[PDB]
PDB file of all heavy atoms in Angstrom:
ATOM      1  N   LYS A 116     -35.860 185.225-121.243  1.00 29.51           N
ATOM      2  CA  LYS A 116     -35.762 184.696-122.613  1.00 29.51           C
ATOM      3  C   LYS A 116     -35.435 183.262-122.614  1.00 29.51           C
ATOM      4  O   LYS A 116     -36.163 182.421-123.001  1.00 29.51           O
ATOM      5  CB  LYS A 116     -34.927 185.425-123.533  1.00 29.51           C
ATOM      6  CG  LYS A 116     -33.340 185.548-123.013  1.00 29.51           C
ATOM      7  CD  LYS A 116     -32.553 186.656-123.620  1.00 29.51           C
ATOM      8  CE  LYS A 116     -32.900 188.037-122.920  1.00 29.51           C
ATOM      9  NZ  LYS A 116     -32.347 188.111-121.465  1.00 29.51           N
ATOM     10  N   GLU A 117     -34.389 182.874-121.938  1.00 31.49           N
ATOM     11  CA  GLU A 117     -33.817 181.472-121.867  1.00 31.49           C
ATOM     12  C   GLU A 117     -32.535 181.428-121.148  1.00 31.49           C
ATOM     13  O   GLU A 117     -32.004 182.473-120.798  1.00 31.49           O
ATOM     14  CB  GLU A 117     -33.687 180.800-123.274  1.00 31.49           C
ATOM     15  CG  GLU A 117     -32.548 181.525-124.136  1.00 31.49           C
ATOM     16  CD  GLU A 117     -33.160 182.412-125.255  1.00 31.49           C
ATOM     17  OE1 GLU A 117     -34.439 182.774-125.262  1.00 31.49           O
ATOM     18  OE2 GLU A 117     -32.491 182.857-126.170  1.00 31.49           O
ATOM     19  N   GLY A 118     -32.158 180.268-120.681  1.00 34.96           N
ATOM     20  CA  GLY A 118     -30.748 179.982-120.161  1.00 34.96           C
ATOM     21  C   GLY A 118     -30.614 180.745-118.726  1.00 34.96           C
ATOM     22  O   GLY A 118     -29.544 181.042-118.407  1.00 34.96           O
ATOM     23  N   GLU A 119     -31.813 181.075-118.065  1.00 34.41           N
ATOM     24  CA  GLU A 119     -31.641 181.739-116.797  1.00 34.41           C
ATOM     25  C   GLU A 119     -31.071 183.017-117.026  1.00 34.41           C
ATOM     26  O   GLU A 119     -30.191 183.708-116.152  1.00 34.41           O
ATOM     27  CB  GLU A 119     -30.848 180.941-115.826  1.00 34.41           C
ATOM     28  CG  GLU A 119     -31.269 181.337-114.268  1.00 34.41           C
ATOM     29  CD  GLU A 119     -30.193 182.288-113.756  1.00 34.41           C
ATOM     30  OE1 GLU A 119     -29.075 182.446-114.051  1.00 34.41           O
ATOM     31  OE2 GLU A 119     -30.578 183.118-112.801  1.00 34.41           O
ATOM     32  N   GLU A 120     -31.206 183.780-118.187  1.00 38.67           N
ATOM     33  CA  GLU A 120     -30.812 185.111-118.522  1.00 38.67           C
ATOM     34  C   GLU A 120     -31.906 186.130-118.078  1.00 38.67           C
ATOM     35  O   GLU A 120     -32.638 186.685-118.870  1.00 38.67           O
ATOM     36  CB  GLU A 120     -30.470 185.200-120.043  1.00 38.67           C
ATOM     37  CG  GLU A 120     -29.447 184.293-120.501  1.00 38.67           C
ATOM     38  CD  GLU A 120     -29.326 184.308-122.121  1.00 38.67           C
ATOM     39  OE1 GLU A 120     -29.569 185.469-122.565  1.00 38.67           O
ATOM     40  OE2 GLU A 120     -29.041 183.241-122.746  1.00 38.67           O
ATOM     41  N   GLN A 121     -31.854 186.323-116.777  1.00 42.81           N
ATOM     42  CA  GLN A 121     -32.925 187.137-116.112  1.00 42.81           C
ATOM     43  C   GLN A 121     -32.182 188.444-115.572  1.00 42.81           C
ATOM     44  O   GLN A 121     -31.120 188.427-115.082  1.00 42.81           O
ATOM     45  CB  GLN A 121     -33.578 186.456-114.945  1.00 42.81           C
ATOM     46  CG  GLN A 121     -32.663 186.179-113.719  1.00 42.81           C
ATOM     47  CD  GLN A 121     -32.888 187.270-112.600  1.00 42.81           C
ATOM     48  OE1 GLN A 121     -33.890 187.919-112.416  1.00 42.81           O
ATOM     49  NE2 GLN A 121     -31.762 187.542-111.919  1.00 42.81           N
ATOM     50  N   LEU A 122     -32.938 189.559-115.843  1.00 42.70           N
ATOM     51  CA  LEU A 122     -32.510 190.807-115.355  1.00 42.70           C
ATOM     52  C   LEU A 122     -33.737 191.743-115.102  1.00 42.70           C
ATOM     53  O   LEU A 122     -34.553 191.761-116.058  1.00 42.70           O
ATOM     54  CB  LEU A 122     -31.393 191.467-116.153  1.00 42.70           C
ATOM     55  CG  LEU A 122     -31.836 192.141-117.570  1.00 42.70           C
ATOM     56  CD1 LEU A 122     -30.696 193.026-117.960  1.00 42.70           C
ATOM     57  CD2 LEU A 122     -31.999 190.988-118.543  1.00 42.70           C
ATOM     58  N   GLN A 123     -33.850 192.308-114.038  1.00 42.22           N
ATOM     59  CA  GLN A 123     -34.997 193.209-113.730  1.00 42.22           C
ATOM     60  C   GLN A 123     -34.582 194.582-114.013  1.00 42.22           C
ATOM     61  O   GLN A 123     -33.513 195.056-113.478  1.00 42.22           O
ATOM     62  CB  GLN A 123     -35.455 192.972-112.324  1.00 42.22           C
ATOM     63  CG  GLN A 123     -34.442 193.322-111.222  1.00 42.22           C
ATOM     64  CD  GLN A 123     -34.938 192.978-109.794  1.00 42.22           C
ATOM     65  OE1 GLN A 123     -35.992 192.279-109.559  1.00 42.22           O
ATOM     66  NE2 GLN A 123     -34.249 193.360-108.735  1.00 42.22           N
ATOM     67  N   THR A 124     -35.528 195.466-114.491  1.00 37.05           N
ATOM     68  CA  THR A 124     -35.341 196.837-114.670  1.00 37.05           C
ATOM     69  C   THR A 124     -36.597 197.547-114.064  1.00 37.05           C
ATOM     70  O   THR A 124     -37.749 197.264-114.418  1.00 37.05           O
ATOM     71  CB  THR A 124     -35.238 197.289-116.166  1.00 37.05           C
ATOM     72  OG1 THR A 124     -36.284 196.529-116.900  1.00 37.05           O
ATOM     73  CG2 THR A 124     -33.898 196.920-116.694  1.00 37.05           C
ATOM     74  N   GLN A 125     -36.348 198.286-112.940  1.00 33.77           N
ATOM     75  CA  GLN A 125     -37.330 198.931-112.266  1.00 33.77           C
ATOM     76  C   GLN A 125     -37.492 200.370-112.642  1.00 33.77           C
ATOM     77  O   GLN A 125     -36.407 201.137-112.544  1.00 33.77           O
ATOM     78  CB  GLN A 125     -37.192 198.745-110.777  1.00 33.77           C
ATOM     79  CG  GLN A 125     -35.951 199.334-110.256  1.00 33.77           C
ATOM     80  CD  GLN A 125     -35.772 199.156-108.761  1.00 33.77           C
ATOM     81  OE1 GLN A 125     -36.382 198.213-108.193  1.00 33.77           O
ATOM     82  NE2 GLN A 125     -34.955 199.941-108.139  1.00 33.77           N
ATOM     83  N   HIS A 126     -38.672 200.914-113.126  1.00 32.86           N
ATOM     84  CA  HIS A 126     -38.956 202.278-113.320  1.00 32.86           C
ATOM     85  C   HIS A 126     -39.560 202.905-112.213  1.00 32.86           C
ATOM     86  O   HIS A 126     -40.748 202.662-111.938  1.00 32.86           O
ATOM     87  CB  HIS A 126     -39.798 202.368-114.649  1.00 32.86           C
ATOM     88  CG  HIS A 126     -39.067 201.572-115.920  1.00 32.86           C
ATOM     89  ND1 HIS A 126     -39.523 200.303-116.033  1.00 32.86           N
ATOM     90  CD2 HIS A 126     -38.237 201.901-116.677  1.00 32.86           C
ATOM     91  CE1 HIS A 126     -38.899 199.837-117.131  1.00 32.86           C
ATOM     92  NE2 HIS A 126     -38.104 200.827-117.528  1.00 32.86           N
ATOM     93  N   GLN A 127     -38.812 203.545-111.318  1.00 31.05           N
ATOM     94  CA  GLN A 127     -39.372 204.265-110.173  1.00 31.05           C
ATOM     95  C   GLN A 127     -40.155 205.454-110.573  1.00 31.05           C
ATOM     96  O   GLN A 127     -39.729 206.285-111.312  1.00 31.05           O
ATOM     97  CB  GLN A 127     -38.266 204.584-109.263  1.00 31.05           C
ATOM     98  CG  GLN A 127     -37.346 203.462-108.838  1.00 31.05           C
ATOM     99  CD  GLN A 127     -37.967 202.334-108.109  1.00 31.05           C
ATOM    100  OE1 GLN A 127     -37.970 202.239-106.901  1.00 31.05           O
ATOM    101  NE2 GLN A 127     -38.618 201.377-108.904  1.00 31.05           N
ATOM    102  N   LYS A 128     -41.355 205.560-110.026  1.00 30.91           N
ATOM    103  CA  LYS A 128     -42.233 206.872-110.257  1.00 30.91           C
ATOM    104  C   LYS A 128     -42.485 207.063-111.762  1.00 30.91           C
ATOM    105  O   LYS A 128     -42.081 208.086-112.379  1.00 30.91           O
ATOM    106  CB  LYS A 128     -41.566 208.098-109.620  1.00 30.91           C
ATOM    107  CG  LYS A 128     -41.278 207.953-108.165  1.00 30.91           C
ATOM    108  CD  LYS A 128     -41.554 209.233-107.510  1.00 30.91           C
ATOM    109  CE  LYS A 128     -40.863 209.432-106.160  1.00 30.91           C
ATOM    110  NZ  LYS A 128     -41.215 208.304-105.169  1.00 30.91           N
ATOM    111  N   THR A 129     -43.197 206.060-112.300  1.00 30.13           N
ATOM    112  CA  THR A 129     -43.696 206.196-113.627  1.00 30.13           C
ATOM    113  C   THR A 129     -45.114 206.839-113.612  1.00 30.13           C
ATOM    114  O   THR A 129     -46.032 206.354-113.025  1.00 30.13           O
ATOM    115  CB  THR A 129     -43.856 204.774-114.383  1.00 30.13           C
ATOM    116  OG1 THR A 129     -42.521 204.285-114.466  1.00 30.13           O
ATOM    117  CG2 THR A 129     -44.396 204.860-115.690  1.00 30.13           C
ATOM    118  N   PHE A 130     -45.146 208.127-114.230  1.00 25.61           N
ATOM    119  CA  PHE A 130     -46.315 209.020-114.118  1.00 25.61           C
ATOM    120  C   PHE A 130     -47.539 208.208-114.772  1.00 25.61           C
ATOM    121  O   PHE A 130     -47.539 208.125-115.985  1.00 25.61           O
ATOM    122  CB  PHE A 130     -45.993 210.242-114.835  1.00 25.61           C
ATOM    123  CG  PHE A 130     -47.125 211.208-114.884  1.00 25.61           C
ATOM    124  CD1 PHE A 130     -47.923 211.585-113.846  1.00 25.61           C
ATOM    125  CD2 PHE A 130     -47.647 211.557-116.224  1.00 25.61           C
ATOM    126  CE1 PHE A 130     -48.892 212.424-113.988  1.00 25.61           C
ATOM    127  CE2 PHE A 130     -48.768 212.367-116.412  1.00 25.61           C
ATOM    128  CZ  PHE A 130     -49.330 212.831-115.307  1.00 25.61           C
ATOM    129  N   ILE A 131     -48.409 207.710-113.926  1.00 29.19           N
ATOM    130  CA  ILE A 131     -49.546 206.909-114.464  1.00 29.19           C
ATOM    131  C   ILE A 131     -50.810 207.661-114.692  1.00 29.19           C
ATOM    132  O   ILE A 131     -51.607 207.205-115.579  1.00 29.19           O
ATOM    133  CB  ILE A 131     -49.735 205.688-113.492  1.00 29.19           C
ATOM    134  CG1 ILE A 131     -50.538 204.585-114.145  1.00 29.19           C
ATOM    135  CG2 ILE A 131     -50.652 206.161-112.302  1.00 29.19           C
ATOM    136  CD1 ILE A 131     -49.714 203.818-115.176  1.00 29.19           C
ATOM    137  N   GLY A 132     -50.953 208.830-114.110  1.00 30.02           N
ATOM    138  CA  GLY A 132     -52.122 209.702-114.344  1.00 30.02           C
ATOM    139  C   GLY A 132     -52.127 210.801-113.416  1.00 30.02           C
ATOM    140  O   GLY A 132     -51.183 211.077-112.688  1.00 30.02           O
ATOM    141  N   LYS A 133     -53.222 211.610-113.486  1.00 28.43           N
ATOM    142  CA  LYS A 133     -53.536 212.741-112.505  1.00 28.43           C
ATOM    143  C   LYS A 133     -54.922 212.385-111.871  1.00 28.43           C
ATOM    144  O   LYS A 133     -55.847 212.095-112.525  1.00 28.43           O
ATOM    145  CB  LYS A 133     -53.531 214.016-113.242  1.00 28.43           C
ATOM    146  CG  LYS A 133     -52.227 214.571-113.488  1.00 28.43           C
ATOM    147  CD  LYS A 133     -52.291 216.083-114.035  1.00 28.43           C
ATOM    148  CE  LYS A 133     -52.591 216.168-115.462  1.00 28.43           C
ATOM    149  NZ  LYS A 133     -51.558 215.572-116.397  1.00 28.43           N
ATOM    150  N   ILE A 134     -54.981 212.624-110.587  1.00 32.83           N
ATOM    151  CA  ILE A 134     -56.066 212.282-109.744  1.00 32.83           C
ATOM    152  C   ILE A 134     -56.552 213.665-109.091  1.00 32.83           C
ATOM    153  O   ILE A 134     -55.818 214.278-108.467  1.00 32.83           O
ATOM    154  CB  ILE A 134     -55.784 211.281-108.651  1.00 32.83           C
ATOM    155  CG1 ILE A 134     -55.902 209.837-109.117  1.00 32.83           C
ATOM    156  CG2 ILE A 134     -56.723 211.524-107.352  1.00 32.83           C
ATOM    157  CD1 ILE A 134     -55.125 208.790-108.351  1.00 32.83           C
ATOM    158  N   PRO A 135     -57.779 214.069-109.377  1.00 32.19           N
ATOM    159  CA  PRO A 135     -58.427 215.224-108.737  1.00 32.19           C
ATOM    160  C   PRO A 135     -58.395 215.146-107.151  1.00 32.19           C
ATOM    161  O   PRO A 135     -58.690 213.948-106.785  1.00 32.19           O
ATOM    162  CB  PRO A 135     -59.686 215.412-109.293  1.00 32.19           C
ATOM    163  CG  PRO A 135     -60.047 214.142-110.021  1.00 32.19           C
ATOM    164  CD  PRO A 135     -58.839 213.475-110.423  1.00 32.19           C
ATOM    165  N   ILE A 136     -58.153 216.101-106.395  1.00 33.07           N
ATOM    166  CA  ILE A 136     -58.003 215.996-104.977  1.00 33.07           C
ATOM    167  C   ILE A 136     -59.103 216.815-104.349  1.00 33.07           C
ATOM    168  O   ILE A 136     -59.417 217.967-104.680  1.00 33.07           O
ATOM    169  CB  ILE A 136     -56.722 216.698-104.613  1.00 33.07           C
ATOM    170  CG1 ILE A 136     -55.464 215.778-105.086  1.00 33.07           C
ATOM    171  CG2 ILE A 136     -56.519 216.796-103.027  1.00 33.07           C
ATOM    172  CD1 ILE A 136     -55.207 214.617-104.368  1.00 33.07           C
ATOM    173  N   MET A 137     -59.680 216.149-103.376  1.00 33.95           N
ATOM    174  CA  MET A 137     -60.736 216.743-102.553  1.00 33.95           C
ATOM    175  C   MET A 137     -60.132 217.768-101.641  1.00 33.95           C
ATOM    176  O   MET A 137     -59.103 217.604-101.013  1.00 33.95           O
ATOM    177  CB  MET A 137     -61.458 215.756-101.729  1.00 33.95           C
ATOM    178  CG  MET A 137     -62.690 216.189-100.949  1.00 33.95           C
ATOM    179  SD  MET A 137     -63.474 214.894-100.097  1.00 33.95           S
ATOM    180  CE  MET A 137     -64.258 213.967-101.459  1.00 33.95           C
ATOM    181  N   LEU A 138     -60.672 218.992-101.539  1.00 34.84           N
ATOM    182  CA  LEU A 138     -60.187 220.031-100.865  1.00 34.84           C
ATOM    183  C   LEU A 138     -60.135 219.812 -99.330  1.00 34.84           C
ATOM    184  O   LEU A 138     -61.137 219.163 -98.880  1.00 34.84           O
ATOM    185  CB  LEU A 138     -60.890 221.465-101.120  1.00 34.84           C
ATOM    186  CG  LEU A 138     -60.186 222.332-102.240  1.00 34.84           C
ATOM    187  CD1 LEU A 138     -60.272 221.585-103.551  1.00 34.84           C
ATOM    188  CD2 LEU A 138     -60.658 223.630-102.189  1.00 34.84           C
ATOM    189  N   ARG A 139     -59.229 220.283 -98.660  1.00 34.66           N
ATOM    190  CA  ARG A 139     -58.974 220.004 -97.140  1.00 34.66           C
ATOM    191  C   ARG A 139     -58.844 218.572 -96.798  1.00 34.66           C
ATOM    192  O   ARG A 139     -58.842 218.326 -95.626  1.00 34.66           O
ATOM    193  CB  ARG A 139     -60.181 220.567 -96.229  1.00 34.66           C
ATOM    194  CG  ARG A 139     -60.680 221.964 -96.688  1.00 34.66           C
ATOM    195  CD  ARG A 139     -59.713 223.044 -96.079  1.00 34.66           C
ATOM    196  NE  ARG A 139     -59.802 224.273 -96.635  1.00 34.66           N
ATOM    197  CZ  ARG A 139     -60.469 225.337 -95.963  1.00 34.66           C
ATOM    198  NH1 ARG A 139     -60.982 225.204 -94.850  1.00 34.66           N
ATOM    199  NH2 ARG A 139     -60.676 226.562 -96.634  1.00 34.66           N
ATOM    200  N   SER A 140     -58.576 217.702 -97.796  1.00 38.55           N
ATOM    201  CA  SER A 140     -58.203 216.357 -97.496  1.00 38.55           C
ATOM    202  C   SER A 140     -56.655 216.399 -97.112  1.00 38.55           C
ATOM    203  O   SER A 140     -56.086 217.450 -97.087  1.00 38.55           O
ATOM    204  CB  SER A 140     -58.440 215.487 -98.697  1.00 38.55           C
ATOM    205  OG  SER A 140     -57.665 215.879 -99.888  1.00 38.55           O
ATOM    206  N   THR A 141     -56.228 215.128 -96.774  1.00 37.26           N
ATOM    207  CA  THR A 141     -54.779 215.097 -96.298  1.00 37.26           C
ATOM    208  C   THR A 141     -53.858 215.385 -97.452  1.00 37.26           C
ATOM    209  O   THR A 141     -52.848 216.124 -97.149  1.00 37.26           O
ATOM    210  CB  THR A 141     -54.395 213.639 -95.751  1.00 37.26           C
ATOM    211  OG1 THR A 141     -55.029 212.600 -96.752  1.00 37.26           O
ATOM    212  CG2 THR A 141     -55.012 213.446 -94.387  1.00 37.26           C
ATOM    213  N   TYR A 142     -54.224 215.091 -98.713  1.00 35.32           N
ATOM    214  CA  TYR A 142     -53.391 215.407 -99.758  1.00 35.32           C
ATOM    215  C   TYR A 142     -53.733 216.689-100.503  1.00 35.32           C
ATOM    216  O   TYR A 142     -53.339 216.932-101.683  1.00 35.32           O
ATOM    217  CB  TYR A 142     -53.434 214.262-100.894  1.00 35.32           C
ATOM    218  CG  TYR A 142     -53.230 212.807-100.286  1.00 35.32           C
ATOM    219  CD1 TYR A 142     -54.329 212.281 -99.602  1.00 35.32           C
ATOM    220  CD2 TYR A 142     -51.961 212.351-100.257  1.00 35.32           C
ATOM    221  CE1 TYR A 142     -54.078 211.032 -99.000  1.00 35.32           C
ATOM    222  CE2 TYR A 142     -51.745 211.177 -99.565  1.00 35.32           C
ATOM    223  CZ  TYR A 142     -52.764 210.471 -98.944  1.00 35.32           C
ATOM    224  OH  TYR A 142     -52.592 209.225 -98.256  1.00 35.32           O
ATOM    225  N   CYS A 143     -54.335 217.645 -99.737  1.00 34.51           N
ATOM    226  CA  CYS A 143     -54.564 218.996-100.192  1.00 34.51           C
ATOM    227  C   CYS A 143     -53.589 219.929 -99.731  1.00 34.51           C
ATOM    228  O   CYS A 143     -53.231 219.803 -98.497  1.00 34.51           O
ATOM    229  CB  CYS A 143     -56.084 219.373 -99.812  1.00 34.51           C
ATOM    230  SG  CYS A 143     -56.443 221.133-100.146  1.00 34.51           S
ATOM    231  N   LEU A 144     -53.241 220.980-100.494  1.00 36.51           N
ATOM    232  CA  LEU A 144     -52.195 222.001-100.058  1.00 36.51           C
ATOM    233  C   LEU A 144     -52.871 222.669 -98.880  1.00 36.51           C
ATOM    234  O   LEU A 144     -52.128 223.416 -98.141  1.00 36.51           O
ATOM    235  CB  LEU A 144     -51.857 222.904-101.190  1.00 36.51           C
ATOM    236  CG  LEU A 144     -51.210 222.181-102.370  1.00 36.51           C
ATOM    237  CD1 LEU A 144     -50.699 223.216-103.269  1.00 36.51           C
ATOM    238  CD2 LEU A 144     -49.977 221.417-101.924  1.00 36.51           C
ATOM    239  N   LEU A 145     -54.220 222.764 -98.697  1.00 36.41           N
ATOM    240  CA  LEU A 145     -54.765 223.459 -97.600  1.00 36.41           C
ATOM    241  C   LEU A 145     -54.857 222.595 -96.374  1.00 36.41           C
ATOM    242  O   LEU A 145     -55.674 222.936 -95.419  1.00 36.41           O
ATOM    243  CB  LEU A 145     -56.214 223.929 -97.947  1.00 36.41           C
ATOM    244  CG  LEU A 145     -56.358 224.771 -99.232  1.00 36.41           C
ATOM    245  CD1 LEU A 145     -57.847 225.222 -99.431  1.00 36.41           C
ATOM    246  CD2 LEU A 145     -55.555 225.966 -99.236  1.00 36.41           C
ATOM    247  N   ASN A 146     -54.238 221.551 -96.342  1.00 36.44           N
ATOM    248  CA  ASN A 146     -54.289 220.618 -95.068  1.00 36.44           C
ATOM    249  C   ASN A 146     -53.397 221.161 -94.076  1.00 36.44           C
ATOM    250  O   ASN A 146     -52.279 221.441 -94.135  1.00 36.44           O
ATOM    251  CB  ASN A 146     -53.842 219.280 -95.597  1.00 36.44           C
ATOM    252  CG  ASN A 146     -54.014 218.203 -94.565  1.00 36.44           C
ATOM    253  OD1 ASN A 146     -55.194 218.165 -93.797  1.00 36.44           O
ATOM    254  ND2 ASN A 146     -53.120 217.311 -94.230  1.00 36.44           N
ATOM    255  N   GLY A 147     -54.008 221.197 -92.827  1.00 37.14           N
ATOM    256  CA  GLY A 147     -53.301 221.656 -91.665  1.00 37.14           C
ATOM    257  C   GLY A 147     -52.973 223.129 -91.508  1.00 37.14           C
ATOM    258  O   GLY A 147     -52.385 223.450 -90.549  1.00 37.14           O
ATOM    259  N   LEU A 148     -53.407 223.650 -92.625  1.00 37.69           N
ATOM    260  CA  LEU A 148     -53.102 225.247 -92.657  1.00 37.69           C
ATOM    261  C   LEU A 148     -53.895 226.025 -91.478  1.00 37.69           C
ATOM    262  O   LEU A 148     -55.190 225.576 -91.348  1.00 37.69           O
ATOM    263  CB  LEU A 148     -53.343 225.947 -93.946  1.00 37.69           C
ATOM    264  CG  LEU A 148     -52.497 225.438 -95.156  1.00 37.69           C
ATOM    265  CD1 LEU A 148     -52.734 226.454 -96.258  1.00 37.69           C
ATOM    266  CD2 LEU A 148     -50.965 225.613 -94.699  1.00 37.69           C
TER     267      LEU A 148
END
């Protein structure tokens, strides 16, 4: 705002969306099974 009144607020893991997963990919639950 002014006067070097700076402060950062970090929101860790903000749910931004859902991505469909290709089967047998690394991020598939059937990976390495």
